[PDB]
Amino acid sequence: AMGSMERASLIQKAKLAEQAERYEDMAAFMKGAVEKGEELSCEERNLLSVAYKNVVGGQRAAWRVLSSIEQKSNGPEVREYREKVETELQGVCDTVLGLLDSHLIKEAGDAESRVFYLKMKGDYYRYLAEVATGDDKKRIIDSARSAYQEAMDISKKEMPPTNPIRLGLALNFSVFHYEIANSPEEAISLAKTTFDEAMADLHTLSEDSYKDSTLIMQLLRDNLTLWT
Amino acid sequence: AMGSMERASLIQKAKLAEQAERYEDMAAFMKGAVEKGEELSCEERNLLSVAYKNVVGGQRAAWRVLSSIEQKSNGPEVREYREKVETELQGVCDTVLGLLDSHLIKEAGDAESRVFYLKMKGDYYRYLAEVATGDDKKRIIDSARSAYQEAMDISKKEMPPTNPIRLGLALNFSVFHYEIANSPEEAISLAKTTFDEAMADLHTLSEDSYKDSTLIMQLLRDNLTLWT
Ligand SMILES: O=C(COc1ccccc1P(=O)(O)O)NC1CCCC1
Ligand SMILES: O=C(COc1ccccc1P(=O)(O)O)NC1CCCC1
Ligand SMILES: [Cl-]
Ligand SMILES: [Cl-]
Ligand SMILES: [Cl-]
Numbered sequence: 001a002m003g004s005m006e007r008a009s010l011i012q013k014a015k016l017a018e019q020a021e022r023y024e025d026m027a028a029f030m031k032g033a034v035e036k037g038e039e040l041s042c043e044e045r046n047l048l049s050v051a052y053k054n055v056v057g058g059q060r061a062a063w064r065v066l067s068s069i070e071q072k073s074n075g076p077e078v079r080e081y082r083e084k085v086e087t088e089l090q091g092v093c094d095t096v097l098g099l100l101d102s103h104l105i106k107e108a109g110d111a112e113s114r115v116f117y118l119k120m121k122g123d124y125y126r127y128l129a130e131v132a133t134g135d136d137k138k139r140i141i142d143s144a145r146s147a148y149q150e151a152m153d154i155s156k157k158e159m160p161p162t163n164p165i166r167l168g169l170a171l172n173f174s175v176f177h178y179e180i181a182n183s184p185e186e187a188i189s190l191a192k193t194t195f196d197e198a199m200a201d202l203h204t205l206s207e208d209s210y211k212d213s214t215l216i217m218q219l220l221r222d223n224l225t226l227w228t
Numbered sequence: 229a230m231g232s233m234e235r236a237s238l239i240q241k242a243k244l245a246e247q248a249e250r251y252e253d254m255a256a257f258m259k260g261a262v263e264k265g266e267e268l269s270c271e272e273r274n275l276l277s278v279a280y281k282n283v284v285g286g287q288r289a290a291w292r293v294l295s296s297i298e299q300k301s302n303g304p305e306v307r308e309y310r311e312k313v314e315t316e317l318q319g320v321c322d323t324v325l326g327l328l329d330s331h332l333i334k335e336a337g338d339a340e341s342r343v344f345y346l347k348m349k350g351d352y353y354r355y356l357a358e359v360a361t362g363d364d365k366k367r368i369i370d371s372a373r374s375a376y377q378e379a380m381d382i383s384k385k386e387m388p389p390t391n392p393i394r395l396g397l398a399l400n401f402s403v404f405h406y407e408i409a410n411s412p413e414e415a416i417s418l419a420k421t422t423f424d425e426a427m428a429d430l431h432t433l434s435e436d437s438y439k440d441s442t443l444i445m446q447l448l449r450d451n452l453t454l455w456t
C-alpha cells in the first residue's frame with residue numbers, strides 16, 4: 001500500500017508519526033521505505049526499530065494481561081481473545097523477520113548495520129518464543145540464539161566495548177538467556193562482563209558518547225540488581 | 229465482522245480489551261454488541277463510551293500534534309499525513325454517530341439512557357467540529373449544540389443536579405461553548421451554575437454517590453480556574 005509513495009516522503013511521514021505517537025502508521029511507513037529496496041541509513045534503521053518495538057510492545061503487554069487472566073481462569077472467550085492478540089503479535093514478528101530476510105541482512109556489509117539487523121532478528125524470534133509452546137518452540141528459541149550469537153561474534157570483533165549497539169545487543173541477549181533459555185547464570189555472566197568491559201573503555205569517549213554508553217550500562221546494572 | 233459472535237461474548241471481550249488497554253478492539257466488540265439490536269444496560273453504555281473516547285482521544289491528540297507542525301510549516305507530506313489522521317478520526321465519529329442514530333437514541337426512553345446517548349451525540353459532533361472548516365462546519369457546530377441542548381433539557385427535568393451523567397453533560401457542553409462556539413461567557417456561566425446547584429444537593433447523597441459527584445464537580449472547578 002506504500003508502493004506509490006516516494007521513499008523520502010515515507011521517511012518524513014515515519015518521523016511525523018513518531019511525534020504523533022502513531023506507531024502502527026510509523027511501522028507501515030518504514031516497512032514501505034524498506035520495500036523500496038535501498039539500504040537504510042543509521043537514522044532510518046533506528047526509525048524502523050522504534051516503530052516495530054512500540055507496536056509489538058503494545059501487543060506483548062496486552063498478551064501478558066490476557067495470559068494472566070487465562071491462567072487464573074484455568075467459556076472460551078478469554079482463550080479466544082488471547083489467541084487473537086497472539087496471532088496479531090505473530091504476524092507483526094513475521095513481517096519484521098521477512099523484512100530482515102528480504103533483503104536487509106544480506107545487503108548489510110558494515111558491522112554497525114549487520115549487528116543492528118541480527119540483533120533485531122534475535123529480538124523478534126525472542127518475541128515469537130515468549131508465546132510459543134512445546135518443540136515448535138525449540139527451533140524458535142534456537143533461531144533467536146543463533147541470530148544473537150552471530151551479532152555478538154561480529155560486535156566483539158568489529159566494535160568497541162562501549163558501542164551502544166553492541167551494548168544493547170548484549171543487554172537483550174542477557175534477557176533472552178534469563179527469560180527464554182532458563183539460563184540465569186549465562187544472563188548474569190554476560191551482563192557483568194559487558195558492563196565491566198564497557199566501564200574500562202569509557203575513558204576513550206567524548207562527553208556525548210559517554211552519555212549514550214552509560215545510559216545502556218545502567219540498564220545492564222538494573223538487570224543485575226533484579227537478578228542477584 | 230462481529231455478526232457471528234454472541235452478544236454476551238462481545239461484552240465479555242470488551243471488558244478484557246479494556247484490561248489489556250486494547251481500545252480499538254474494545255470499540256469494535258462494543259459496536260458488534262450494539263449491532264445486535266438490543267438496548268444497552270448502564271454498564272454496557274459505559275463500555276461503549278470508554279472504548280470510543282479512547283480511540284478518538286488518540287486520534288485527536290495526534291491530529292493536534294500534526295496540525296501544529298503544519299501551521300508552523302505554513303512539500304505536501306505534513307498536510308497529507310494530517311489529512312490521513314483527520315479522515316480516520318472522521319470515520320470513527322461517523323461510526324459512533326451512526327450507532328446512535330441506528331437505533332440507540334430512538335429506543336432510549338429512560339432519562340439516564342436518553343441523556344447519555346444525546347451527550348455522546350454532542351461530543352462526536354464536537355470532535356467533527358474541531359477539524360471542520362468554513363460553513364460545512366456551521367451545520368456541524370449546530371448539530372453538536374442541538375444534541376447537548378436536548379440532553380440538558382431532559383437532564384434538568386428528570387435528574388437531580390448531582391447525577392454524574394448530568395454533571396458530565398454540563399461539563400462537556402461548557403467545553404463546547406468555550407472551545408467550539410467562541411462563547412467563553414456561556415461556558416463559565418454554565419460551569420458555575422452547574423457546580424453551585426450540585427453543591428446544594430450533595431447533602432442528599434450516600435458516601436459513594438458523594439464521591440462520584442464531587443469528582444466531576446472538581447473537573448468543573450478546574451475549568452473555571454483555567455477560564456477565569
Ligand atoms: O518491561 C520490559 C523490559 O524489557 C526489556 C528490558 C531490557 C532489554 C529488552 C527488553 P524487551 O523484552 O526487548 O522489551 N518490556 C515490556 C515491553 C512490552 C512487554 C514487556
Ligand atoms: O485534554 C483534554 C481535556 O478534554 C476535556 C475536558 C473536559 C471535558 C471534556 C473534554 P474532551 O474534549 O471531550 O476530551 N482532552 C484531550 C483528549 C484528546 C485530545 C484532547
Ligand atoms: Cl476474539
Ligand atoms: Cl554484504
Ligand atoms: Cl499519508
Ligand SMILES: [Cl-]
Nearest residue numbers: 334335336337
Ligand atoms: Cl422510546
Ligand SMILES: [Mg+2]
Nearest residue numbers: 005006007008
Ligand atoms: Mg522515487
Ligand SMILES: [Mg+2]
Nearest residue numbers: 083086087131
Ligand atoms: Mg496460537
Ligand SMILES: [Mg+2]
Nearest residue numbers: 039107108109
Ligand atoms: Mg551493503
Ligand SMILES: [Mg+2]
Nearest residue numbers: 233234235236
Ligand atoms: Mg445470541
Ligand SMILES: [Mg+2]
Nearest residue numbers: 311314315359
Ligand atoms: Mg479533510
Ligand SMILES: [Mg+2]
Nearest residue numbers: 267335336337
Ligand atoms: Mg426503550
